[PDB]
Symmetry: C3
Subunit: 133 residues, 3 copies
C-alpha cells in the first residue's frame, strides 16, 4: 500500500532477522517517532532489569504512538535499535520480538546498535521508528 | 505550519525532556543535516572538555546549517543525540539545552544515545537533525 | 538532479571528511536502507578482523541494495556510520572509503558513531543509508 519492501536475491536473507534490506516510501507524509523506552505513562520502568521485558514495553509504546498518529506497524518504514551492554545471546529474542512487531507485515529496515548507555542507567533498550501515512 | 507535533495523553510526558514523541512531516522537501560537532569554522574545538560547552557549539552549528539552507529550528522534524561516556548527572542540562534549541517551538523527536566514542577523542557530543522546508 | 548539497562558507570544510553538512531532498520517493554489515550473500563474514576490509564489503552491500532498488550512490541523501572500539587511527581510511563510495558525486551527510558492539562480535562496522528516487 503505502510502502514497498526490497530484499535482493543477491543479498543474504534478512527477514529471518526481522528486517528488510530496504523499504521504498512512495507516500509524501512521513511520521518521525522519537526513540521509545521502557516507560509507562507515569514514567515508571516496565520490565525491571530484564531486556526482553523492557523490549516488549518499547514495542508497545511504538505501537501506541503509531496508533495515536493514525498508523500501524505495517506503516513503519524504518527502525533503529539501541541496546546497552549487548550480548549476542539475546540477539535471537530481540529479532523475534521486532519481527513480531510488524504483526505479519513485511518487516521494515532496521539497524542494531550496541551502545554504552541510554538516558538513564535503568534503561536497557531504545527503539526509534519512521513511518509514512 | 510545515510540521505537526504528536504527544499522546496515553504516554508519559516527553516535553519536560525537550522532545515530542513524534513529529508528522506534511511537506515534501526534507533537509538532512549531518551529525554536528563542537568545531568552529577553522575546525578548532569549542568548549574544551566541558560537555555543556561543546553542546552549545553543536546547537549553534545546527542552527547555522539550518539558516544557510533557509530553515529555522522550528522546522526541525527530528534530532539524534550522541554522548560519549554519558553520565545521568548531565542529562538535565542536555535536555534543557535541546529544549531551548527550538526557540519556543514545540520540540522535535529526539533519541538520546550514550556512545563509546566519536570521530576523535576530543569530541564529546554529536547531534544530527532532519527538517522540512 | 534528485538532491542538492549544502556546505556553508561559515562552517568548517566537511568534504575532506567525505560528507556534506546537509543534503536537501526535493524528490518525493525515499529509500531507507537497513544498516549494512560485512556479510556476503551466504551470510559469511567478508574481511576477517580487518576494519578496512569489512568496510569495503559494507559499501559494496550498500551499492548493491541501491542498484537493486534502481538507485546509485549519487542518490544517497544520508549515511550513518557505526564503528566498534573506534580508534582515531582508522578515521582517515574510513573517511577515504566513504568519500570514494559516492563515485565522484558530492558526498551525502554522514554521522560517525563509535559504538560498543554490533549484532555479533565478529561485526566491526555498520553503515545505513537513505536515498531518494
Amino acid at each position: 500500500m503505502n510502502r514497498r519492501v526490497i530484499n535482493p536475491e543477491t543479498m543474504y536473507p534478512s527477514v529471518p532477522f526481522g528486517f528488510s534490506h530496504a523499504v521504498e516510501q512512495l507516500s509524501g507524509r512521513t511520521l518521525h517517532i522519537a526513540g521509545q523506552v521502557a516507560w509507562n505513562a507515569n514514567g515508571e520502568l516496565v520490565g525491571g532489569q530484564d531486556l526482553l521485558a523492557q523490549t516488549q514495553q518499547v514495542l508497545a509504546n511504538l505501537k501506541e504512538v503509531l496508533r495515536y498518529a493514525g498508523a500501524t506497524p505495517a506503516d513503519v518504514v524504518r527502525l533503529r535499535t539501541y541496546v546497552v551492554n549487548h550480548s549476542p545471546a539475546n540477539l535471537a529474542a530481540i529479532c523475534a520480538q521486532i519481527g513480531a512487531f510488524y504483526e505479519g507485515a513485511d518487516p521494515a529496515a532496521n539497524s542494531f546498535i550496541g551502545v554504552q548507555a541510554l538516558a538513564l542507567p535503568e534503561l536497557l533498550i531504545e527503539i526509534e521508528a519512521t513511518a509514512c501515512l
